[PDB]
Design a protein around this ligand. Structure first.
Ligand SMILES: [Zn+2]
Lengths: 48, 280, 199
């Protein structure tokens, strides 16, 4: 019983970790232009 | 550099608020808009004395929805009547969308602010304005250079600008990032309030008209029967009180029925006998 | 034959939402050979990559903004709001249009030109600067014509949508427009539009 309880203890405490989103390496970022596109360009729904 | 104080208020007149609500509802589910006239009394006051609607256009609510001919002629002829107030700002209705400014709303507000730095963009939700609460807000803007430099949009000198809390719905739609909410106060003098009081001011007559006596007796019968059932429940509950240490109430309902009975019958008796003795 | 089959049911959830329609401040032109379109005051050419001509030939065509006027000089630019002012610019000609195409508030600054010299100084991309230029603004036939000399003729005409605003007297507004920041390919540009009125 203690072995099972400790196993669940480790499982809940070990966590999740990343969960690392698709972030490009720096110096490839044009955050200014990215914001410009966000505030300027618009999405389009596709259709048949 | 001068900064707009957070204590600045928008004093909307009673007439302006009523016209704004009526026009906003009349255009549901479309978004209607119009111009608010008034005066910038000082750096901390924007008085909206009156607001006139504008003809609906298929564009929606944009800077192309202000027909120059309509605005100019309306202003000229109002000035003839005696209302020579400048165009303080503009208003439009977000039916069920809450109070905030969209990208195009921010755009038209930039256009208006180019006319005068002080200019408000009050919006009103006409279907969320159910009797009681009125869902309406007023926003100006934040200059982009002001925000990017890190300085706060508005200087603060009092608690007036923070008595009310911003809404989440407005906050996600850009509040405190591109536009700031301006506190709204309603200028209601005694005369306007007394005039509005006539809406439900009953009469000099219904103070003297007795209830339909058969209807009165039937109501008395029904309430007394309900009160009998409630008394049975009250007795049953009180018997439990004894065999129960400190650990809907048939009593509270009983008290409410008693109060309604006494008020109804006392009023009916007194009105009846006042009638007997004032009418010969 | 004796099939008599039941029927199941698989629903498909369906919904969408129109966002806040986004104003794209884009200019278009076909001055010499290329249908260049630029978004923008940071400038970025959308289509019509590295220009066969210099940028300056089109930098003068750049609502929502107006020159600074003193209290003595009537600010036709300012009081023409909220609607704004529409102008015809003659260099090559330029006009500003406000349209509702799609879900974008289009503030077109549509450009157009002709009579491009085969070795004119506008296409070799040579450029020093634009020296401060004074526009004499005056009314000819009910239209606010601004005559400006180009130094590096301009016959600007400004008409307000509110055709009731009084016409200011003939004054001399000094414009100082220079290409502040850019790249060699001229695809990431920052423009300066400073201009003050002078009586
Ligand atoms: Zn809106």
């Amino acid at each position: 019983d203690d072995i099972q309880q400790l196993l669940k203890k480790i499982n809940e405490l070990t966590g999740i970790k990343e969960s690392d989103t698709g972030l490009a390496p720096p110096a490839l970022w044009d955050l200014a232009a990215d914001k410009q596109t966000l505030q300027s360009e618009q999405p389009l729904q596709v259709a048949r | 550099a001068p900064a707009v104080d957070t204590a600045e208020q928008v004093y909307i007149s009673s007439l302006a608020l009523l016209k704004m609500l009526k026009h906003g509802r009349a255009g549901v589910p479309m978004e209607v808009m119009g111009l608010m006239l008034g005066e910038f009394v000082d750096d901390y006051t924007v008085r909206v004395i009156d607001v006139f609607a504008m003809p609906q256009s298929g564009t929606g609510v944009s800077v192309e929805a202000v027909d120059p001919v309509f605005q100019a002629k309306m202003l000229d002829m109002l000035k003839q009547t005696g209302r020579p107030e400048m165009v303080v700002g503009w208003y439009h209705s977000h039916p069920g969308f809450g109070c905030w400014l969209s990208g195009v709303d921010i755009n038209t507000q930039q256009s208006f602010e180019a006319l005068s730095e002080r200019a408000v963009a009050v919006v009103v939700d006409p279907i969320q304005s159910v009797k009681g609460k009125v869902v309406i807000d007023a926003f100006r803007l934040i200059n982009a250079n002001m925000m990017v430099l890190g300085h706060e949009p508005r200087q603060t000198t009092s608690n007036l600008g923070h008595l009310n809390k911003p809404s989440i719905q407005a906050l996600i739609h850009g509040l405190n990032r591109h536009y700031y909410s301006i506190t709204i106060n309603y200028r209601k003098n005694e005369l306007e309030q007394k005039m509005l009081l006539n809406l439900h001011k009953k009469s000099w007559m219904e103070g003297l008209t007795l209830q339909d006596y058969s209807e009165h007796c039937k109501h008395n019968e029904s309430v007394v029967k309900e009160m009998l059932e409630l008394a049975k429940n009250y007795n049953k509950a009180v018997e439990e009180e004894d065999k129960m240490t400190p650990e809907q109430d048939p009593k509270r309902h009983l008290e409410e029925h008693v109060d309604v009975l006494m008020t109804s019958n006392i009023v009916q008796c007194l009105a009846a006998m006042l009638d007997t003795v004032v009418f010969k | 034959g004796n099939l008599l089959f039941l029927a199941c049911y698989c629903i498909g959830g369906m919904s969408a939402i129109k966002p806040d329609m986004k104003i794209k401040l884009r200019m278009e032109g076909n001055v010499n050979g290329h249908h260049f379109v630029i978004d923008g005051m940071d400038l970025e050419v959308k289509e019509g990559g590295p220009l066969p001509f210099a940028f300056d030939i089109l930098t003068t065509a750049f609502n929502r903004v107006f020159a600074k006027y003193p209290d003595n000089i009537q600010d036709y630019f300012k009081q023409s709001f909220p609607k704004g002012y529409s102008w015809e610019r003659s260099l090559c000609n330029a006009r500003n249009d406000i349209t509702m195409e799609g879900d974008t508030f289009y503030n077109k600054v549509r450009f157009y030109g002709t009579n491009f010299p085969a070795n004119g100084p506008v296409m070799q991309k040579k450029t020093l600067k634009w020296e401060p230029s004074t526009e004499k603004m005056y009314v000819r036939d009910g239209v606010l014509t601004g005559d400006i000399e180009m130094a590096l003729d301009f016959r600007t005409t400004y008409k307000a949508k509110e055709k009731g605003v009084k016409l200011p007297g003939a004054h001399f507004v000094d414009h100082c427009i220079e290409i502040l920041s850019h790249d060699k390919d001229y695809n990431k540009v920052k423009l300066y539009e400073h201009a003050v009125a002078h009586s």
